[PDB]
Amino acid sequence: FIVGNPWDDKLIFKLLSGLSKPVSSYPNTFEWQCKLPAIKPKTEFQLGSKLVYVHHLLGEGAFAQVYEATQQKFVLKVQKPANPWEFYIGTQLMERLKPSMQHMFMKFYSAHLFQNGSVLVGELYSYGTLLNAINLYKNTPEKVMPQGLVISFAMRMLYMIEQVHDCEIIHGDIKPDNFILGNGFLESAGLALIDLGQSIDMKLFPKGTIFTAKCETSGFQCVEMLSNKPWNYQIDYFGVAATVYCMLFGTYMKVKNEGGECKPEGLFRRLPHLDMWNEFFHVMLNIPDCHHLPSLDLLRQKLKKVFQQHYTNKIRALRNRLIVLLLECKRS
Numbered sequence: 001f002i003v004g005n006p007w008d009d010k011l012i013f014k015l016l017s018g019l020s021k022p023v024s025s026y027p028n029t030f031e032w033q034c035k036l037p038a039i040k041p042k043t044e045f046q047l048g049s050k051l052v053y054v055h056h057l058l059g060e061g062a063f064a065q066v067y068e069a070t071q072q073k074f075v076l077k078v079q080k081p082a083n084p085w086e087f088y089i090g091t092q093l094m095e096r097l098k099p100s101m102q103h104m105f106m107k108f109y110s111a112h113l114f115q116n117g118s119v120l121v122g123e124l125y126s127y128g129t130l131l132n133a134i135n136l137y138k139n140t141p142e143k144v145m146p147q148g149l150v151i152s153f154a155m156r157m158l159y160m161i162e163q164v165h166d167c168e169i170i171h172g173d174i175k176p177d178n179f180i181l182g183n184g185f186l187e188s189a190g191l192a193l194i195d196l197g198q199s200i201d202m203k204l205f206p207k208g209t210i211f212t213a214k215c216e217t218s219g220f221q222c223v224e225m226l227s228n229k230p231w232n233y234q235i236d237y238f239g240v241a242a243t244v245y246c247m248l249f250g251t252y253m254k255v256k257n258e259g260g261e262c263k264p265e266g267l268f269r270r271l272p273h274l275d276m277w278n279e280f281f282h283v284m285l286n287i288p289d290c291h292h293l294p295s296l297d298l299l300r301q302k303l304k305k306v307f308q309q310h311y312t313n314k315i316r317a318l319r320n321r322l323i324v325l326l327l328e329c330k331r332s
């Protein structure tokens, strides 16, 4: 079966409207028949029965604001209009995941839906985005993240979407600012994938459904989109590839085609493990069809071999270097 836009507003309204267990029926869902209250740094406000103290704004995305808060810290994802969809996705993901996996993602504890917006209450990750981390390295002598950390993060990402895809979900927006580092990093274990607002639940579609939308909700395109070919899970493969590209070169990935072979731009000078990375980008960017998705496990093993061959000893020195950079930015 074929579907135009998996992010279409009327489509999501209908998918939610016809759920056996609609978001409105969750025990941790709360509906309110009033406007979204004003939310501001270092200020209290009423969120249902509870009074909530907001600290400072943690970050801003394409659609929403995420603040730190307490009544154990947690976050408030605030969005206009309301986004019950992200809450639905988050709920399903945590249901379908093996409990040992859930630490790689962000739990939503509750959702407060209003007439014109929503507040999603979720888990906190305290040490900024991967995009930010990449920026922190730009302002150092070394300029780029070390290979040990890059290969490490890359493997975790491959592992992450492997778990997500196993739940038959598509993240749909895998990029540097949707990866967060938490305090679990102080003790790749602390890396978390967040922002499920553009995610797709394939279980809500017939077996073998594919999509033809030639672009994302903010202009970005994956490989199949650039060729007007169909796609489902490939969009996440592209996202991971683009993310690792950004860790490697500090800029956003652009692709070219040469003889039916898709590959990222750049002359790849100053790039170590050139053979490993070319094989990585080859497999990630040249997916024949929706039926022949490359083994995420296999990709990660190839990175693991190189990692084990060069960086087992040194990862401790590398993560320390980063934590120092992270703490400096947080206290700032």
Ligand SMILES: Nc1ncnc2c1ncn2[C@@H]1O[C@H](COP(=O)(O)OP(=O)(O)O)[C@@H](O)[C@H]1O
Residues within 6 Å of the ligand: 058, 059, 060, 061, 062, 063, 064, 065, 066, 075, 077, 106, 122, 123, 124, 125, 126, 128, 129, 177, 178, 180, 194, 195, 196, 197
């Ligand atoms: N769990 C979290 N802990 C700390 N900051 C977060 C968390 N989740 C998101 N953020 C910050 O909020 C920003 C926007 O949130 P996100 O979920 O990406 O919404 P959007 O869909 O608008 O991108 C992110 O870029 C990130 O910096």
Ligand SMILES: [Mg+2]
Residues within 6 Å of the ligand: 061, 062, 177, 178, 195
């Ligand atoms: Mg985001």
Ligand SMILES: [Mg+2]
Residues within 6 Å of the ligand: 061, 062, 063, 173, 195, 196, 197, 198
């Ligand atoms: Mg989003």
